């Protein structure tokens, strides 16, 4: 029970991401860029997965199915207000984003507002504070 089982997946891979087996599974799957502690715990709930185990001890079929859970939210009865991309301008579909998909959409959205010449995009080009912060005495390590 407490001695290291054979095929203890020390170094797992979930969407080209080197995840640790030594960390507990709920706090281990949050290494992916687009899932936090909140989204991790609710997905490891939705897939009937015992979260008393480490990420070395779970089975490969359970890693596969829970990756299908993470990409497919509404096929497993998860709320629409839980997602990090809700009612997009292009597809109008409320859809969760994972590892590299975030960096894709983030790069697109910054270039988007930059080319349509919104003041928000202009501050993002100048690399200033954009949500209307006072920069008289803040953000100095930014510009040396």
């Amino acid at each position: 029970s407490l001695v290291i089982p054979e095929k203890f997946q020390h170094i797992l891979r979930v969407l080209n991401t080197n995840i640790d087996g030594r960390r507990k599974i709920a706090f281990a799957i949050t290494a992916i860029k687009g899932v936090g502690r909140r989204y991790a715990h609710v997905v490891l709930r939705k897939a009937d997965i015992d979260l008393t185990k480490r990420a070395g001890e779970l089975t490969e079929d359970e890693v596969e199915r829970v990756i299908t859970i993470m990409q497919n939210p509404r096929q497993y009865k998860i709320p629409d207000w839980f997602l990090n991309r809700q009612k997009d301008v292009k597809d109008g579909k409320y859809s969760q984003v994972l590892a590299n998909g975030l960096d894709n959409k983030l790069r697109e959205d910054l270039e988007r507002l930059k080319k349509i010449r919104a003041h928000r995009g202009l501050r993002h080009f100048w690399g200033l504070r954009v949500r209307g912060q006072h920069t008289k005495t803040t953000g100095r390590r930014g510009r040396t």
Binding site: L2, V3, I4, P5, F8, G21, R22, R54, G56, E57
Partner: peptide, 8 residues
């Protein structure tokens, strides 16, 4: 995180 044989 789990016992080696000789550690257990």
């Amino acid at each position: 995180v789990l016992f080696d044989k000789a550690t257990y």
